[PDB]
């Protein structure tokens, strides 16, 4: 009995979205860095360079001097999101230069000079076929330029356990990880990624007993989350076991005279971490947490904490 | 959410059906609920119209057919139901202080309005369990017993146990000798708080006051798996108990989570 | 000369997006409100109810008690966005009840009662074909329930200038505005919409000289924005003239005995304001402002300020 | 005038089944027994064995 073109009979509607809205942000961090194996101190030694992709280093947390507005977006989106699922983390490395330190002697004194060797090239170690962990004292320790592990090398004369791809200057080496393991409609608790002991999605079932992770590295997850004093939530999920071997960089091992040759590389390490934020619903639901489980993190009182970095997973026929 | 389909809020309602389930639960090692059907009918709508003679004020009741009953889903919100006792389950007398469907500032409720001659009837699929598991037979004499389906929330003051999480793990005691390990995958189920209300109308002084006559019809389909011809105490390994609010607490709150999000693969 | 399936020759890339990323958020505000024409005070009089769609009231700024997480999203997205373009603002009104106050007399005293009139219905006034403005003292004044203008009505015995659609109970009246006027790749400065004198996009060229808007209501925009002490930016844009007539609600005007009949309506006023936030780029560019022009706002020292609400725009053949 | 996908006009229904429901049970009894015609007493004599079906 009412008249209009806009008018219509009343139907069931509540305009609120109940949490179905999503925002895909890409966390980008791009750097031109020095890999110095020449120096005798401060992780600049011959020891290989480890990229802690396993730690959430994609925020460039190793330094505050690198914060792109992107990270400032994630920080915001993590305020308005009940959960996020990482995906398509992309590491892309470029070698602009290769520089070797050639010792020289005038007979009065010895000074070092730097020459270009294009024939030699950078090596990407995967530390596959071996079980190796990364010590993490602090976020500054994440810097792959200064990050090292004593008595480690890619080239092992007796048994070489490393799969390694060699990166020439004008060629860029770029690898990609699929970080969405979670199924059964579960998500990761929003984390500003201000803690390095926070480790990437994916389940490598190993954990140090000195720093218990919790359930998030086992395919079958079981956790009781405290929403408040009143309500616990039981999170249970099936996620696939993921390896995440230790990836490291190194120069050729060449004995030359006395100590081995010493190279220093200039690289631009490009990073893209795709994040799909599921924004909080229009009406506050504290209990969406039942679909969120926290990021894996190295716990305990320990200052230094070791990430497993399991090399690989076996495959079995059915 | 509470197993109120037995009409446990009152003993005066026991149909021979319930007396069947009580029996079938004696001879059954397990049951799987399914196709719980709630069907509501509105025969009348009656408003209390205040009247004043100036000496005294008396109330009368008139029919408003234009106005109608509302089915609140309490979706898009997290709300719980206090349960002191089974009589508290009665949906006629069951209320929560400072709650309403119509919220002037933000309306979080999805609600369907039920006219008189129209009946509102909703259905739940109560078979979550897979991997050939069943629910322990329960005569449903306890209200703190909650329906099948996993809404992962539980009050820490009244720990449910594993039965609200998709991945179930429980050690059942068959006897002093033999424990059984039950493990199952069941889907997360929401079970929002469903409620009924009258229109909120300020009129003069307090809001208008309606009283509805309804017939609330219920069908809970139960498939009882009868005990085998020979006693096997160890069939329990395929049965896990109904979720229940535990603890010493007299009053106990059911989560009634509104909804589950969906994520693309 | 390097080996790998991931390796490839170096090509020009900078992973940063230079501001091409967008986020579409819908600002939702939903309310069940009382329209009371019975009361003799506080905007509850017979005087019609004005919906200030022209003011940015879609945030429900008239009250702090209504803030949905949505608004809390916009607040965030406006931190990380250099500009936004509003679009598809949708006003949707529902009438659950119609209630008339019937005077009664016992002869000792007179008391009022409330009865249901379904035959009568709510009216949506457009205030078209007339030039009328909305006084705004404060944000609480935006409430369409208590918002009124003295000596105004939809039903004018001498000349009826109003186009009005009547809304029965079970029918909902829902109108939609296209708020993207801007072209030539321009956007609106991010505003948390905490100020009511902020007015919607669209150019109704009228402005009170007591409260100069600035260029944003004229098709041809010219403004000098101060980025910092050092750099001014010149914004120039062509946007279409938009009318935005005053929209108001009223009850039937019925003389009955003595003063007119008095109805009170129960409505649920649903709102969806679609906002596309263009997020800040990965690298800080302060100078994106050259593509952003501020929301129109009533300026000046004036406490009370009048929005034009021009009824319509004429059309001319070419 | 009411809105929903679940709603429908009221029709005659009484959900009760008025006794149309049936349950088929099989009474099973299985035994390994001795038929002894040797014994001179207690029905074990030559006399045939009767099954009281």
What the block records as the tokens of B40 is 């509501």
Q: How far is CA C194 from CA C90, C138, C211, in A?
A: 20, 11, 19
Technique used to solve these coordinates: cryo-EM
Among A12, A13, A14, the residue to mutate for chain D (most D Cβ within 10 A): A12
Say yes or no for a CB contact (<8 Å) between A187 and B107: no
Determine contact: C70 vs chain B, CB below 8 A: no
Contacts of residue C308, Cβ cutoff 8 Å, sequence gap at least 6: C131, C133, C204, C206, C207, C208
Distance CA A94, CA A71 (A): 22
Among C24, C29, C73, C126, the residue to mutate for chain A (most A Cβ within 10 A): C73
CB B260 within 8 A of CB A185: yes
CB A217 within 8 A of CB A243: no
CB A145 within 8 A of CB A36: yes
Q: Which chains neighbour D (Cβ–Cβ under 8 Å, 3 or more pairs)?
A: A, B
| Other CB atoms within 10 A of residue A116 CB | 11
Q: Please provide residue A6's backbone torsions phi and psi, each rounded to the nearest 5 degrees.
A: -80, -25
Where on the phi/psi map is residue C6: left (φ > 0), alpha (ψ -120 to 50), or beta?
A: alpha
CB A273 within 8 A of CB A19: no
Name every chain A residue with its beta carbon within 8 A of the beta carbon of B159.
232
Distance CA B68, CA B64 (A): 8
Pairing of strands B118-124, B28-52: antiparallel
CB A104 within 8 A of CB A113: yes
Where do breaks (C to N over 2.5 Å) occur in chain D, by preceding residue number? none
Distance CA B201, CA B207 (A): 5
Distance CA A287, CA C207 (A): 48
Nearest-CB residue to B118 (from D8, D16, D28): D8
State how far Cα A150 lies from the chain centre.
Answer: 21
Q: Which B-chain residues 105-164 have CB contacts (< 8 A) with chain D?
A: 112-122
Closest D-chain CA to B110: D4
Distance CA A161, CA D6 (A): 65
Pairing of strands B179-185, A122-125: unpaired
Distance CA B157, CA A230 (A): 7
Q: What is the 3-state secondary structure (H, E, C) of chain A?
A: CCCCCCEEECCCCCCCCCCCCEEEEEEEEEEEEEEECCCCCCCCCCCCEEECCCECCCCCCCCCCCCCHHHHHHHHHHHHEEEEEEEEEEEEEEEEEEEEEEEEECCCCEEEEEEECCCCCEEEECCCCCCCCEEECCHHHHCCCCCCCCCCCCCCCCCCCCCEEEECCCEEEEEEECCCCCCCCCEECCCCCCCCCEECCCECCCCCCCCCCCHHHCCEEEEEEECCCCEEEEEEEECCECCCCCEEEECCCCCCCCCCCEEEEEEEEEEEEEEEEEECCCCCCHHHHHHEECCCECCCCCCCEEECCCCCCCCCCC
DSSP-assigned states of every residue in B44-64: EEEEEEEEE-SS-EEEEEEE-
Place of tokens 């003063």: C259
Determine contact: D4 vs chain A, CB below 8 A: yes
Distance CA C2, CA C8 (A): 9
Distance CA B251, CA C6 (A): 62
Q: Which A-chain residues 271-310 have CB contacts (< 8 A) with chain C?
A: 271-272, 279-284
Contacts of residue A134, Cβ cutoff 8 Å, sequence gap at least 6: A50, A52, A54, A55, A147, A149, A246, A306, A307, A309
SS3 at position C271: strand
Closest D-chain CA to A11: D3
Q: How far is CA C146 from CA A84, C40, C249, in A?
A: 42, 11, 11
DSSP-assigned states of every residue in chain D: ----SSEEE--------TT------------------S-SSTT-SSSPP----
What the block records as the tokens of A187 is 């998500």
Among B62, B77, B107, B199, the residue to mutate for chain C (most C Cβ within 10 A): B107
Nearest-CB residue to B52 (from C36, C68, C111): C111
Distance CA A293, CA A181 (A): 12
Pairing of strands B134-135, B239-240: parallel
Say yes or no for a CB contact (<8 Å) between B112 and D4: yes
CB C248 within 8 A of CB C53: no
Closest B-chain CA to A85: B263
Determine contact: A230 vs chain D, CB below 8 A: no
Beta bridge partners of C224: C234
State how far Cα C110 lies from the chain centre.
Answer: 41
Name every chain C residue with its beta carbon within 8 A of the beta carbon of B210.
none
Q: Which of the 8 DSSP states describes residue C72?
A: H
Burial class (CB in 10 A: 0-12, 13-18, 19+), B57: exposed
Place of tokens 């449910």: B160
Nearest-CB residue to B203 (from C66, C99, C109): C99
Beta bridge partners of B244: B145
Place of tokens 């037979």: B137
CB C125 within 8 A of CB C48: yes
What the block records as the tokens of B84 is 């002191």
Distance CA A226, CA B249 (A): 19
Distance CA A191, CA A74 (A): 9
Where would I find the H helices in B65-215?
Answer: none
Determine contact: A9 vs chain B, CB below 8 A: no
Say yes or no for a CB contact (<8 Å) between B68 and D16: no
CB B219 within 8 A of CB B230: no
CB C237 within 8 A of CB C221: yes
Q: How far is CA A240 from CA A126, A179, A243, B59, in A?
A: 21, 11, 10, 67
User: CA quadruple C219, C222, C227, C228: dihedral positive or negative?
Assistant: negative
What the block records as the tokens of A79 is 């305020």
Nearest-CB residue to A279 (from C3, C21, C73): C73
Say yes or no for a CB contact (<8 Å) between B105 and C60: yes
Helix (H) or strand (E) holding B211, with range, is strand B209-226
Determine contact: C81 vs chain A, CB below 8 A: no
Which residue from A208, A216, A218 is spatially nearest to A305, judged by alpha carbons? A208
Tell me the nearest-neighbour CA distance from B202 into chain D, angstroms: 22
CB C44 within 8 A of CB C36: yes
Angle formed by the axes of helices A69-80 and C69-80, nearest 10°: 180
| Other CB atoms within 10 A of residue B90 CB | 13
> What Å resolution does this PDB entry report?
3.0
Helix (H) or strand (E) holding B38, with range, is strand B28-52
Tell me the nearest-neighbour CA distance from B40 into chain D, angstroms: 9
CB C166 within 8 A of CB C122: yes
Nearest-CB residue to C97 (from B104, B106, B201): B201
Name every chain D residue with its beta carbon within 8 A of the beta carbon of A14.
none
Burial class (CB in 10 A: 0-12, 13-18, 19+), C177: middle
Distance CA C69, CA C27 (A): 9
Distance CA C147, CA C154 (A): 15
Name every chain B residue with its beta carbon within 8 A of the beta carbon of A220.
167
Contacts of residue C67, Cβ cutoff 8 Å, sequence gap at least 6: B106, C60
Distance CA C246, CA C209 (A): 20
Q: Which of the 8 DSSP states describes residue C306?
A: E
What the block records as the tokens of D52 is 């009281």
Distance CA B241, CA B140 (A): 12
Q: Which of the 8 DSSP states describes residue C128?
A: T
Distance CA A199, CA A54 (A): 6
Tell me the nearest-neighbour CA distance from B9 into chain C, angstroms: 33
Which residue from A89, A100, A95, A83 is spatially nearest to A124, judged by alpha carbons? A95
Number of CB pairs < 8 Å for A and C? 150
Q: How far is CA C145 from CA A311, B29, C34, C49, C201, in A?
A: 66, 62, 7, 6, 24
Name every chain A residue with its beta carbon within 8 A of the beta carbon of B157.
230
Contacts of residue C244, Cβ cutoff 8 Å, sequence gap at least 6: C53, C54, C200, C202, C204, C309, C310
Q: Please provide residue B238's backbone torsions phi and psi, each rounded to the nearest 5 degrees.
A: -100, 0
SS3 at position B220: strand
SS3 at position C139: helix
CB B197 within 8 A of CB B70: yes
Which residue from A214, A221, A265 is spatially nearest to A97, judged by alpha carbons? A265
State how far Cα A113 lies from the chain centre.
Answer: 35
CB A291 within 8 A of CB A84: no
DSSP-assigned states of every residue in C78-99: HHHEEEEEEEEEEEEEEEEEEE
| Other CB atoms within 10 A of residue A211 CB | 18
Measure the CA dihedral A26/A32/A37/A38, to 10°.
Answer: -160
Q: How far is CA C132 from CA A105, B180, C123, in A?
A: 92, 78, 18
State how far Cα A151 lies from the chain centre.
Answer: 23
Determine contact: C68 vs chain B, CB below 8 A: yes
Distance CA D13, CA D20 (A): 16
In chain D the first and final C-alpha atoms are separated, in Å, by 66
Q: How far is CA B131 from CA B21, B134, B206, in A?
A: 24, 9, 55
Nearest-CB residue to A278 (from B169, B259, B261): B261
Q: Please give the radius of gyration of chain B, using alpha carbons only, rounded to the nearest integer.
A: 22
Nearest-CB residue to B105 (from C31, C107, C109): C31
Q: Please provide residue A72's backbone torsions phi and psi, each rounded to the nearest 5 degrees.
A: -65, -20
Q: How far is CA C40 from CA B29, B252, C44, C146, C242, in A?
A: 70, 48, 6, 11, 36
Measure the CA dihedral A164/A167/A172/A173, to 10°.
Answer: 0
CB C142 within 8 A of CB C60: no
CB A201 within 8 A of CB A179: yes
| Other CB atoms within 10 A of residue A100 CB | 20
């Amino acid at each position: 009995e009412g008249y209009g073109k806009h008018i219509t009979s009343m139907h069931v509607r509540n305009i609120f979205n109940q949490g179905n809205q999503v925002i895909r942000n890409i966390v980008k961090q791009q750097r031109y860095e020095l890999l110095d194996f020449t120096g005798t101190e401060a992780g600049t030694t011959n020891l290989p360079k480890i990229i802690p992709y396993q730690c959430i280093w994609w925020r460039g947390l190793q330094n505050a001097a690198n914060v792109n507005q992107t990270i400032n977006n994630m920080i915001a989106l993590n305020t308005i999101s009940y959960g996020v699922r990482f995906l398509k983390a992309k590491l892309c490395i470029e070698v602009y230069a290769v520089t070797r330190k050639r010792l020289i002697q005038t007979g009065a004194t010895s000074y070092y000079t730097d020459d270009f060797e294009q024939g030699q090239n950078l090596f990407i170690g995967w530390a596959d076929r071996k079980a190796e962990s990364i010590p993490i004292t602090t976020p500054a320790d994440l810097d792959e330029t200064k990050l090292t592990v004593a008595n480690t090398t890619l080239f092992d004369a007796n048994n070489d356990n490393i799969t390694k791809e060699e990166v020439p200057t004008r060629e860029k080496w770029c690898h990609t990880w699929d970080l969405d393991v979670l199924n059964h409609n579960y998500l990761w608790e929003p984390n500003n990624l201000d803690s390095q002991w926070t480790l990437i999605p994916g389940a490598q079932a190993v954990q140090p007993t000195a720093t218990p992770i919790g359930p998030t590295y086992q395919e079958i997850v079981i956790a009781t989350k405290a929403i408040g004093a009143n309500e616990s939530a039981l999170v249970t999920t099936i996620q696939d076991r993921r390896s995440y071997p230790r990836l490291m960089l190194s120069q050729p091992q060449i004995k030359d005279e006395t100590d081995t040759m010493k190279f220093k590389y200039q690289i631009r390490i490009s990073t893209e971490l795709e994040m799909e934020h599921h924004i909080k619903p229009d009406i506050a639901n504290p209990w969406l947490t039942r679909q969120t489980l926290p990021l894996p993190a190295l716990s305990g009182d320990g200052t230094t904490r070791y990430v497993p970095c399991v090399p690989y997973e076996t495959h079995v026929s059915q």
